[PDB]
Design a protein around this ligand. Structure first.
Ligand code: CO
Length: 270
């Protein structure tokens, strides 16, 4: 029955965005005291739960970028540190943006960050979850290479195959370490409960990273992942982008995808 405006619409009232690249100056005046307090609450919650769960590089990135514990960060201030580390910067966007625009940003070492915050894929998820690893030069190079692939993928109708790769790496990836399994996916790192389940539960599959397998795997957004893909190094991700994806897309185009909860005959199951 009744339809009401969504959070993206409400938050962006009176604001504008580039019609081509979808950026805007970060609207600092729009963050209320409640927003800063919500940020602080989420930050404190995650920083209590993540030690021994997040990969070490993630927690180090928070500190090296001086990500504010007590307020929504000033993007420009964060950029001074990020630019010096890896030549990356974050740019504010209104919310969900078109894929070609998103890929063009990453291809140019710009990471789009939704500016607004949830009330008590918002700025907490996109900044706290996604940005700290951009100080890692190997991970940053993986994201740049990913972005550069957007033109080819769009031309071939293969953007959803790249979306699966992004989902199962950047958003929901795990990294194995001698100290045990750790988390690098931003969607897990900003989550209250998925960081617990993804390491502690016997329920989800933990499967070794395989590029073709992943690009042939469905995902859903409404639920905890049924399968997590595990890398041994960020180098594995960057190296996965080396070959020509065009013949991989065409091979996959006619295949039946793996379901979100499937185990494939060739999986290294961890
Ligand atoms: Co995300």
């Amino acid at each position: 029955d009744f339809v009401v405006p969504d959070i993206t619409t409400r938050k962006n009232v009176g604001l504008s965005h580039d019609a081509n690249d979808f950026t805007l100056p970060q609207p600092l005046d729009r963050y209320s005291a409640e927003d800063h307090a919500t940020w602080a609450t989420l930050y404190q919650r995650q920083c209590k739960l993540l030690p021994g769960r997040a990969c070490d590089e993630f927690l180090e990135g928070l500190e090296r970028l001086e990500v504010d514990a007590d307020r929504v960060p000033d993007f420009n201030k964060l950029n001074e540190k990020l630019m010096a580390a890896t030549g990356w910067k974050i740019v504010a966007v209104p919310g969900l943006i078109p894929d070609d625009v998103f890929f063009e940003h990453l291809a140019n070492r710009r990471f789009p960050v939704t500016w607004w915050l949830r009330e008590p894929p918002d700025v907490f998820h996109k900044l706290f979850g996604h940005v700290p690893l951009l100080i890692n030069p190997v991970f940053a190079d993986y994201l740049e290479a990913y972005g550069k692939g957007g033109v080819k993928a769009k031309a071939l109708g293969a953007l959803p195959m790249l979306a699966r790769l992004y989902w199962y790496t950047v958003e929901f990836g795990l990294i194995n370490t001698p100290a045990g399994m750790r988390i690098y996916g931003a969607g897990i790192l900003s989550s209250k409960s998925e960081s617990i389940y993804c390491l502690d539960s016997a329920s989800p599959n933990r499967v070794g990273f395989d590029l073709m397998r992943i690009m042939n795997t469905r995902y859903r957004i409404d639920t905890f992942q049924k399968t997590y893909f595990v890398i041994d190094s960020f180098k594995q991700l960057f190296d996965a982008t080396a070959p020509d994806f065009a013949p991989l897309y065409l091979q996959l185009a006619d295949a039946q995808p793996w379901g979100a909860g499937d185990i494939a005959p060739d999986d290294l199951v961890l």
